[PDB]
Design a protein around this ligand. Structure first.
Ligand SMILES: Nc1ncnc2c1ncn2[C@@H]1O[C@H](COP(=O)(O)OP(=O)(O)O)[C@@H](O)[C@H]1O
Length: 424
């Protein structure tokens, strides 16, 4: 009977998924963000709010009437500043990939060496940059991440975030606190309270129950970031489970009982339930595949590969030099020689070599302290290549399969379900 709504506010549009408690999808949809008015000080946020209302309307009314819990994900370090009394968004949002290099020396002066906040795109750099513009009445402002802000439109209790969204402002999910080096600064007064992802905040506002026909007891739960929501969609929750994304770049995520952070390799941990999600990403993968072969060619050529035979070719497939993970070398050369005359042999070498890099990545995470990988689920454009699944199973020496779901909005709907179950 009861259903669970997840939404995903990504880089270009919004998506939703509604599930039952067994994870069966009852409704799903997508919308591109609409334009915003040039003069609108909310900027993109006005578009995001429009998309929230459009997505809600797109849910069939019979489905809305059963939705018991709502959660949503947004993009990492997309930062809004609001007045606490009026709710007015005080400036155009600082987007996930926007940088505030002006603030970075100040952040490096207060934060531990190589802390994740010490990057110009971090939420903290954005906060410090905004603070230092000396807006009148800045002491009455509050910071919200994109997901927090969209959820606050639904529940009307200002100022709450989650362990994942808050990592890039300096929140420590291991101690479940903001550290003293951050609390010692006056802009810390803008920081939101922080709860676990997928926990209840409060009931859905009456305006939404009245307008859209949600039940009066529908709750709204904290969310997460889009990258983590997409991982959650794989429904893997035990230490040693991993997801490889075979996308334009090769990104791996490993669930661990042990926290792992290493700036040499750009390795970072997020908290998930009572465990740690450990991630790293390589510049190999789909972008170099696409430079060499169309999608149609990859499918056709892969048909000719015998995935149980190893390629003798040692490649490091890259479009240009440089790697951070699993090799920390900004000058690391692409290696695609020798190139055999057979495109099938060439492709086999590339796919096998990317599997070696994937394996090397999981080995590194383990040597840095993570729970050793036991099973690898696969997402991204490369997941549909069953020959490559088999190549990877052989090279990794671990069971490999397709993740059953990979949409962030599906992962957000699992957080809605988590929060409902905890709330009952
Ligand atoms: N059969 C295939 N085998 C391996 N890779 C593939 C295959 N088909 C498409 N791709 C690769 O998938 C990449 C796109 O992956 P995707 O996860 O959809 O993209 P993005 O990272 O941009 O979100 C492309 O670079 C493409 O080369």
């Amino acid at each position: 009977e009861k259903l669970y709504l997840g939404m995903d506010f990504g880089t270009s549009g919004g998506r939703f998924t509604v599930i039952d408690e067994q994870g069966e999808i009852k409704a799903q949809g997508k919308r591109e963000y609409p334009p915003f008015m040039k003069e609108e000080s909310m900027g993109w946020a006005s578009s995001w709010k429009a998309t929230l209302f459009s997505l809600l309307e797109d849910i069939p009314v019979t489905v809305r009437s059963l939705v018991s819990s709502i959660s949503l994900d947004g993009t990492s370090a997309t930062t809004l500043i609001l007045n606490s009394e009026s709710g007015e968004v005080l400036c155009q949002p600082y987007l996930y990939n926007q940088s505030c290099p002006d603030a970075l020396p100040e952040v490096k002066s207060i934060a531990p060496a190589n802390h994740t906040v010490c990057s110009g795109t971090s939420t903290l750099c954005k906060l410090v940059s905004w603070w230092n513009t000396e807006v009148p009445n800045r002491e009455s402002a509050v910071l919200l991440h994109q997901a927090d802000w969209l959820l606050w439109l639904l529940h009307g209790r200002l100022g709450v975030s989650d362990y994942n969204n808050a990592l890039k402002v300096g929140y420590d999910p291991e101690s479940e606190s903001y550290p003293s080096w951050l609390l010692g600064q006056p802009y810390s007064q803008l920081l939101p309270k922080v709860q676990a992802p997928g926990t209840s905040i409060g009931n859905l506002k009456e305006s939404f129950t009245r307008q859209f026909g949600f039940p009066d007891d529908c709750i709204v739960c904290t969310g997460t970031t889009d990258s983590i929501a997409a991982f959650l969609a794989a429904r893997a929750t035990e230490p040693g489970k991993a997801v490889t994304s075979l996308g334009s770049t090769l990104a791996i995520k490993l669930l661990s009982t042990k926290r792992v952070d290493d700036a040499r390799y750009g390795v970072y941990s997020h908290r998930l339930d009572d465990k740690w999600l450990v991630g790293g990403a390589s510049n190999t993968g789909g972008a170099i595949l696409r430079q060499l072969f169309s999608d149609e060619q990859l499918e056709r050529l892969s048909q000719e590969i015998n995935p149980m035979v190893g390629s003798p070719l040692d490649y490091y497939p890259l479009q240009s030099s440089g790697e951070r993970f699993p090799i920390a070398d900004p000058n690391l050369a692409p290696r695609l020689l020798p190139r055999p005359e057979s495109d099938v042999e060439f492709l086999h070498g590339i796919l096998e070599s990317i599997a070696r890099i994937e394996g090397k990545g999981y080995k590194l995470l383990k040597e840095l302290g993570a729970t050793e990988a036991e099973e690898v689920l696969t997402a991204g454009g490369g997941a549909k290549n069953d020959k490559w699944i088999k190549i990877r199973q052989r090279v990794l020496g671990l069971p490999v399969k397709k993740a059953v779901h990979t949409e962030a909005s599906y992962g957000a709907s699992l957080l809605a379900l988590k929060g409902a179950k905890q709330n009952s």
